[PDB]
Subunit: 122 residues, 2 copies
């Protein structure tokens, strides 16, 4: 039935991995998010960074790459919703980033995507 | 060391009261972009919380917010040391932590986006 592209939120907060921690937290505070999704010049999703990793490696870390986690679970645009929801609800994932066939960052399914979904079913 | 929660907590936590319907609740949740509502009475005293989850499960046989409230809330007072409440979210897996004044009145919560603030101050 329904795909993720339908309900996903089309404004996932990204930063490039050339940018400093000073700059990364700057965005994170403005945008009200505990992570950043890492993305290259052409917007191919590459990893994520944590607020914690910023805090553990702050003294000897100058940049976003210095602390990047490249093993992100993303899910393609046209995947079935049920699966990604099932992952977040039960398998503990905090949100699931959404890409296109070129692995370009295109959306996020946050817990407030579950609201959207539950709101619609009334 | 000696910094409190009140200093940092974000002072707009999303409440609802126990009369409101599920239709009413999920409305507030969507607007505000939040997976849970905190439950407060006429005089704003913290009582519990409801989820997207429970709203989703009990939809068919549940008209009111009270029908599915979770009365057992971890909460903390305004003047608790930040350090303890922060250490709870981080390594004890609490999703966020509601802060009350000494009359158990919701005055704030401490989100994962309260940590950024902390980490931002430290630089
Ligand atoms: N009664 C209430 N009053 C006030 N707030 C309430 C509340 N009940 C629940 N919440 C908050 O709702 C937020 C929504 O969770 P969600 O997974 O959509 O949203 C999460 C997370 O999925 C999202 N996020 C993280 N990295 C992101 C990125 N790179 N792009 C977009 N979103 C990101 O940022 C949000 C930050 O988590 P946080 O715990 O700060 O914020 C949570 C939680 O603290």
């Amino acid at each position: 039935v329904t795909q993720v592209a339908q309900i996903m939120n089309t404004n996932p907060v990204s930063i490039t991995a050339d940018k400093s921690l000073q700059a990364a937290i700057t965005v994170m505070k403005e945008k009200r998010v505990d992570t950043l999704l890492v993305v290259d010049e052409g917007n191919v999703l590459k990893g994520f960074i944590d607020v914690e990793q910023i805090d553990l490696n702050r003294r000897t870390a100058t940049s976003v790459m210095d602390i990047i986690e490249k093993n992100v679970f993303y899910v393609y645009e046209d995947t079935l919703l049920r699966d990604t929801v099932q992952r977040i609800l039960k398998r503990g994932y905090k949100y699931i980033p959404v890409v296109d066939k070129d692995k370009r960052l295109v959306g996020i399914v946050t817990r407030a995507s579950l609201v959207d979904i539950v709101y619609d079913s009334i």
